[PDB]
């Protein structure tokens, strides 16, 4: 009965509801293009749902020693992020008709970001944990850079309806994403200042906003047709 279970349960419910909702709305639409967005967008919270349910039931948590103590690390988060973050980027890539190579680089960078983040989370030498964290954050900044400069520019060539929608989704992604590394740094994976129960609350808020919130904005717009 870990203190943060209440947030894992709240996260489970929200990802679950969002999943079903997007799924229903998705299966009713007939437009080929919109169907693509709905599929990608529905899968995201569907995966988050399964990982959150897993954590709620006691999986994806391991004790890692560093700083002279045993620290609880939820590695299941990375299993979630490994697949969801690139799908979210895919959504944006499709919305602005980004080039194949740009997509590859983004997903690749994303892989580096999640992968190094996990190694960092499992590293036993306190100082090295932050080396991986920095490597990971740098990869994240490359992603946000391309989204902000590269994608926005690509968006300008689209109709104002698509560009505007992209901008909202872009802003939401930059704000929420730029926060993860800060939570990691001050939470149980980093300095251990914010306790795991509040940290789980923070990630849940960021996760729901970045997936279901993102989905609601995207799937409710005409930019997907
Ligand atoms: C029965 C299994 C395995 C036991 C070995 C254990 C492992 C994780 C446990 C849940 C979590 O602790 C979260 C939450 C805490 C509440 O307090 C009571 C309810 C709940 C849903 C727990 C129920 C049950 O206890 C679980 C499923
Ligand atoms: C639904 C989940 C989303 C949109 C998660 C996004 C997660 C990130 C942008 C995570 C970034 C991290 C770093 C930059 C470094 C430290 C470790 C991570 C994996 C928390
Ligand atoms: C030989 C050890 C080298 C360590 C380099 C660490 C770089 C850390 C950057 C983040 C620091 C966060 C402090 C809270
Ligand atoms: C004390 C009992 C808490 C039960 C919390 C349930 C949260 C949603 C679970 C959904 C499983 C599909
Ligand atoms: C995908 C091409 C650009 C890759 C940038 C990688 C940055 C890694 C920092 C650790
Ligand atoms: C792909 C780039 C990998 C960089 C690894 C750095 C490890 C530092 C350990 C102290
Ligand atoms: C690119 C190769 C990076 C190798 C890192 C090795 C780290 C060893 C820590 C004990
Ligand atoms: C021993 C002092 C190490 C300071 C590292 C600063 C790294 C800045 C870029 C992450
Ligand atoms: C002990 C300090 C190790 C620093 C490794 C930096 C790797 C940077 C890869 C981009
Ligand atoms: C066209 C709707 C696709 C839905 C895929 C859902 C996967 C959970
Ligand atoms: C992918 C690099 C992993 C390094 C692990 C080092 C464990 C001492
Ligand atoms: C948003 C930062 C919260 C910090 C809580 C610290 C409790 C010791």
From Swiss-Prot:
SMART domains for the chain: Bac_rhodopsin (SM01021)
Site annotation Primary proton acceptor: residues: 80
One of the record's GO molecular function terms: photoreceptor activity
Cytoplasmic face residues: 25-38, 92-102, 150-167
GO biological-process terms attached to the record: phototransduction; proton transmembrane transport
Pfam families, per the entry: Bac_rhodopsin (PF01036)
TM ranges: 5-24, 39-57, 75-91, 103-122, 130-149, 168-186, 199-218
Topological domains, Extracellular: 58-74, 123-129, 187-198
PROSITE patterns: BACTERIAL_OPSIN_1, BACTERIAL_OPSIN_RET
Residues recorded with modification N6-(retinylidene)lysine: 211
UniProt keyword annotation of Zinc present: no
Keyword annotations: Cell membrane, Chromophore, Hydrogen ion transport, Ion transport, Membrane, Photoreceptor protein, Pyrrolidone carboxylic acid, Receptor, Retinal protein, Sensory transduction, Transmembrane, Transmembrane helix, Transport
Oligomeric and partner information: Homotrimer.
PANTHER family tied to this protein: BACTERIORHODOPSIN _OPSIN, NOPA (EUROFUNG) (PTHR28286:SF2), PTHR28286
Function: Light-driven proton pump.
Stated name of the protein: Bacteriorhodopsin
Species this chain originates from: Halobacterium salinarum (strain ATCC 700922 / JCM 11081 / NRC-1)
Lineage: Archaea, Methanobacteriati, Methanobacteriota, Stenosarchaea group, Halobacteria
